[PDB]
Design a protein around this ligand. Structure first.
Ligand SMILES: COc1ccc([C@H]2N[C@H](C(=O)O)Cc3c2[nH]c2ccccc32)cc1CN1CCN(c2ccccc2F)CC1
Ligand SMILES: COc1ccc([C@H]2N[C@H](C(=O)O)Cc3c2[nH]c2ccccc32)cc1CN1CCN(c2ccccc2F)CC1
Ligand SMILES: CCCCCCCCCCCCCCCC(=O)O
Ligand SMILES: CCCCCCCCCCCCCCCC(=O)O
Ligand SMILES: [Ca+2]
Ligand SMILES: [Ca+2]
Ligand SMILES: [Ca+2]
Ligand SMILES: [Ca+2]
Ligand SMILES: [Ca+2]
Ligand SMILES: [Ca+2]
Ligand SMILES: [Ca+2]
Ligand SMILES: [Ca+2]
Ligand SMILES: [Ca+2]
Ligand SMILES: [Ca+2]
Ligand SMILES: [Ca+2]
Ligand SMILES: [Ca+2]
Ligand SMILES: [Ca+2]
Ligand SMILES: [Ca+2]
Lengths: 649, 649
């Protein structure tokens, strides 16, 4: 099943779909080289599952500080998740590690042996593998850097995280220098403030002076402690504030902003680099296909040679036109010349143009079946009235749900009937899922993102129903009222309003695209939390806990547990009342060096990654602006002054 | 002193300097129409003083709540500034109002009577004047909206604030709609969270439910109360956090960012509008001058006609070249044609080109004096070695100062000698001021910004010396160690490092340019504070003060006084622990409507003006990037494909 022309057409569709591989030749459908990656996909879904669960091993992982004394699994030094036993832990560690290993050495399948070993990615991946396994054996017989290779093996296990990392690296160098200037602002400012308030009342806050005045000026840099840090000085003199305002201003509006400007520039650049490299890589496939078609090597393809290529592209991928004797006729009209030679570089541009205009990916097959009985249903499902029907069923679902919930707030028993109706609503959706997938096929249905999401939500509902009914309100209310979110697609309605089209459109294109960078910033938290659990086992818990933190101890109710540490790290990441974690923990250890963690976290994530995501969101929104602006034709683009099309048919 | 050609040349220099006036003709230097605005400048400096002091009347203004009972000018309901008496207040109110009035009706001088009255600006300005005066009389005989016209009269008293306001207005419309979408996010989110936690423990925080759950979700939108707001829920269930993270995320990284994106777009647009209009206005002057030169009206200027114009431009404004018989020769070389006709539109482009290249503003005169004795000094001052000498004197000043201060921190009496030396240092600077101004002239010296700043700082030092010595350490230490800032120009040194050139250059171009927008956001605070003093006279002060605020009462140590209210408003503007002011004051009045102030302040300044200043800083930095990039030639720009210069001489 490997037509000669056919190899080429499909490959064109790979260029447009943009799939990535780098194998220079497959000897005679798949052929020897393709079949490996070809069967890698099925393993790729399960692989997905394996890296997610493998990765979640760390939260359910049992803590290291509990293994010694004293009170075992008490609420003292508080925790909240299931934890895990090493007997129950190791079976899973070994399953994840074995399956993982299969996955890591599967590439040699489609790669040269010495090629797989020589590649830096495979050597590093396999290295983390080796560390993981050695530590799993050691663990079996009887634990410090075992999780780190969990998150590190995970970060490069998925490409989209990987290339995001790479994007960071390029802007990292410049980021460091700008950090140097920032640090000179902090040093100098701390100095002048401290010297200003040495013989004054704020000697108590400046008691440690520059070592501490630098600390306080640093937190004031965040504004997290704005009124509180200089309140003794302000009490001493109303004019003292004139400094801090002056200091806060410059710190926040002048410095902290153009920092972001730096990150915006570096990021924008690196993204240009990344998409351009992406373009060379896609063109690699395109030129590959063409080169296959061009047997003679002259660098051009005959009319008779390219006609077939259009035939299998038109039939196989996209709906363009119908070949004819008049085929030849069209060739005569364009130039009234008779060579019929299209270049290697020209053919690619042709195919991309076919992608934007002629392209529109036809269904794959799906049967050994008859079209009649289903055939009724199919045309009726694709009808617009059908979509109207689902719209109205979700509107009627919204009113239904509002009523059920409001009945819970009212507490009347009348909430029960409507709630059962909500379950019936759920069924409609499963039907919609089953019919829709039956009507378009699984591959098309999965092509659109909203349908993938819908599918998965629906299935959360179904498993919720089996569990809920086999298992026997709060048992059901909580589980099913949330999934009202499947009514969320109704928001695309607002795009019809001209004002809100850029906001909702940018938000919807933003929900997936922001995901690589959000995951990037999330792993950072995983590593940081592995660090935290190791370094802060306690909390002097009994005198030092109450002295360290009051209101904050209400906040410092966490960081002795990995989930605890994840949510606490979130609190730091949003930067709300963050310093209480920094100062309190500082005196739980007693050494200022502890604070480095927190100043290491700030710079890496608050001054780098979050600023980055700002740049990403603004850049995406602006792209949207230019797109909608382009749809109403303007900013006319040709090759320099004008294009040499020479008139149409 | 009004040469016919000369009127035109100088006007060209107005185009390049960009001064603004709109008078269509001055009948036969100044002439009838120019002389008015011409003598407006001297009055413009004093006017400056008058709007600043007039404006500062509000802080020194005596409060309205103290006028009734009870305890008069106690520390109870605390205050800290001088306040003012109505006998001492009214003399100044009337002086400011009279001088101001002279200023407001001075334009008819250069304007048509019905023209001045018809202009919207003059009618509004004069209207605020009339309100001010009426209230000053009423005040004399014996107070609510009198200050508002102080800040409003001030905002349009200076152009740069005015056009910034105008810039805001254009983006204001769109800003409102985006605010609508934001408000639907707040409403919907508050709903779903509240329904989620109605039958749960966080019923106490959700006790008032949507009225209050909307409030809490709103503050969580700011992250100002992140850990604290949902701590009871998190205590009830660790999984509760899964909501807030999900909520916080979307609120901060998705929504709050693209809000800024909106402000960035609207602002960038409005700035394009403003600078383009600026360009039409400048070209108005250019075309005016040319039209004057072109007596025949054909629309072009003869060689003999334009030669004179170049002669008085070269002599009067900038150093270009020397006219010759070969003058004619150059004309023959360009085109080997003999018409010598340059168009109205062409002449303008010519003049702008002369600005960038040939232009370089020669000293104005300054004498009835002899050049000999000063003439030594002058060439020596302009020498580069002289600047090196000041550089080294400021370096030696930095070490000197570090030593004095460190002696204060050490507390040794040895701090005294060095400190006296610092005073001698100050004198060097006054010399540098006096010599420099003598060597370049006051107008050139004032042309460069660093020299204006230096001048003023130096003078703070001199008045400090007269006051300090006539008046008799802390008396001197505080007053003179600060002015070490005149050593701050040493930072331009870092621009020599390639990395830091964009940061320091963007920061230095940013210090003045950010000033219009900072002033804009500052007046907002003046109005808001006039509102605050009126609406919050008390603080039930005695039970309600201690109940309302603890730590916060340490923060709610203010807002009963105008200066107090200004610094407190600053604390809100930086958004650090802001909600304590909102909630506490809310129960000092007891009505939720109070909170509107604080939600009115947030949206107007935190979601609009500050986001704006972000846009401004990033945009400025990017402009810098493109400028330095342009200096190393790239991105070659011509009129479309190529320019028709036709070769040089
Ligand atoms: C490296 O050790 C120094 C060099 C200079 C200073 C400043 N102290 C001087 C003083 O006592 O007055 C004035 C001055 C300083 N820095 C300046 C820069 C320019 C001009 C004046 C100064 C402080 C230090 C000590 N610092 C260095 C940084 N430290 C530190 C660094 C990383 C993590 C945690 C930390 F605590 C804390 C202690
Ligand atoms: C105008 O009065 C309303 C309309 C709708 C609601 C929400 N309450 C509903 C409920 O009780 O469950 C659900 C729901 C709401 N809003 C929605 C939007 C879409 C879908 C569901 C909802 C609340 C209110 C009352 N709100 C309106 C706004 N209020 C307010 C406005 C400005 C300043 C100060 C304020 F306190 C506070 C009280
Ligand atoms: C580079 C200049 C920065 C300084 C900014 C000026 C701030 C004004 C300082 C006034 C504080 C007076 C302190 C007196 C304390 C007291 O009276 O006990
Ligand atoms: C649109 C979906 C939003 C919902 C996000 C999911 C958050 C998980 C909710 C779990 C909270 C469980 C509350 C139980 C309280 C208790 O046990 O007393
Ligand atoms: Ca295939
Ligand atoms: Ca283990
Ligand atoms: Ca001391
Ligand atoms: Ca002192
Ligand atoms: Ca060929
Ligand atoms: Ca033709
Ligand atoms: Ca917490
Ligand atoms: Ca003049
Ligand atoms: Ca008054
Ligand atoms: Ca209730
Ligand atoms: Ca319930
Ligand atoms: Ca003429
Ligand atoms: Ca020539
Ligand atoms: Ca305060």
């Amino acid at each position: 099943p490997f037509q000669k022309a056919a190899a080429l057409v499909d490959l064109a569709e790979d260029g447009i779909g943009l799939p990535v591989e780098i194998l220079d030749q497959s000897s005679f459908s798949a052929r020897y080289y393709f079949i490996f990656t070809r069967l890698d996909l099925i393993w790729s879904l399960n692989y997905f599952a394996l890296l997610f669960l493998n990765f979640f091993e760390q939260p359910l992982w049992c803590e290291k500080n509990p293994k010694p004394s004293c009170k075992d699994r008490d609420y003292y030094y508080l925790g909240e998740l299931p934890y895990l036993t090493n007997a129950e832990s190791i079976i899973y560690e070994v399953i994840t590690l074995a399956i993982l290993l299969v996955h890591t050495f599967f590439p040699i399948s489609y790669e040269g042996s010495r090629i797989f070993w020589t590649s830096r990615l495979n050597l590093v991946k396999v290295a983390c593998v080796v560390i993981l396994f050695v530590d799993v054996l050691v663990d079996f017989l009887y634990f410090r850097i075992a999780p780190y290779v969990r998150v590190i093996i995970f970060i490069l296990s998925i490409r989209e995280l990987r290339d995001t990392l790479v994007l960071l690296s390029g802007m990292l160098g410049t980021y460091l220098n700008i950090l140097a200037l920032w640090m000179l602002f902090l040093l100098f400012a701390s100095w002048i403030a401290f010297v200003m308030f040495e013989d004054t009342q704020q000697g108590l806050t400046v008691f440690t002076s520059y070592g501490a005045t630098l600390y306080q000026m640093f937190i004031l840099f965040t504004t997290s402690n704005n009124p509180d840090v200089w309140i003794p000085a302000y009490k001493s003199s109303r004019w003292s504030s004139v400094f801090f305002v002056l200091y806060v201003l410059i710190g926040v509006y002048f410095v902290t902003n153009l920092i972001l400007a730096v990150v915006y520039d570096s990021f924008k650049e690196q993204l240009a680099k990344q998409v351009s490299g992406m373009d060379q890589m896609k063109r690699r496939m395109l030129e590959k296909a063409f080169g296959l078609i061009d047997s003679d090597k002259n660098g051009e393809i005959d009319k008779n040679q390219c006609i077939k290529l259009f035939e299998q592209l038109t039939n196989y991928r996209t709906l363009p036109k119908i070949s004819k004797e008049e085929f030849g006729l069209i060739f005569d009209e364009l130039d009234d010349t008779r060579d019929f030679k299209i270049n290697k570089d020209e053919f690619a541009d042709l195919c991309q143009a076919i992608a934007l205009r002629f392209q529109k990916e036809e269904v794959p097959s799906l049967q050994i079946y008859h079209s009649a009985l289903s055939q009724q249903l199919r045309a009726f499902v694709r009808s617009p009235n059908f979509g109207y029907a689902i719209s109205f069923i979700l509107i009627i679902n919204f009113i239904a749900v509002v009523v059920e919930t409001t009945l819970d707030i009212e507490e009347s028993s009348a909430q029960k009937p409507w709630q059962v109706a909500e379950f019936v609503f759920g069924w409609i959706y499963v039907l919609e899922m089953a019919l829709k997938i039956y009507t378009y096929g699984f591959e098309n249905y999965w092509r659109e993102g909203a349908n993938r999401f819908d599918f998965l939500v629906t299935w959360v509902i179904v498993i919720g129903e089996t569990a809920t009914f086999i298992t026997p309100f709060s048992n059901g209310e909580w589980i099913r009222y949330l999934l009202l979110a499947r009514m969320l697609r109704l928001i695309r309605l607002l795009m019809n309003v001209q004002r809100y089209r850029a906001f909702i459109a940018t938000f919807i294109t933003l929900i997936p695209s922001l995901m690589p960078y959000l995951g990037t910033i999330f792993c950072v938290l995983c590593i940081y939390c592995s660090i935290g659990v190791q370094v802060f086992g306690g909390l002097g818990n009994k005198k030092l806990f109450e002295t360290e933190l009051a209101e904050d101890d209400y906040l410092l109710f966490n960081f002795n547990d990995y989930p605890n540490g994840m949510v606490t790290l979130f609190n730091l990441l949003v930067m709300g009342n963050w310093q209480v974690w920094m100062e309190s923990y500082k005196d739980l250890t007693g050494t200022w060096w502890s604070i480095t963690y927190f100043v290491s976290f700030y710079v890496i994530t608050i001054l780098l990654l979050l600023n980055l995501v700002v740049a990403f969101v603004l850049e995406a929104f602006f792209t949207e602006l230019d797109l909608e602006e382009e749809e109403k034709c303007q900013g006319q683009d040709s090759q320099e002054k004008r294009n040499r099309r020479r008139s149409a048919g």
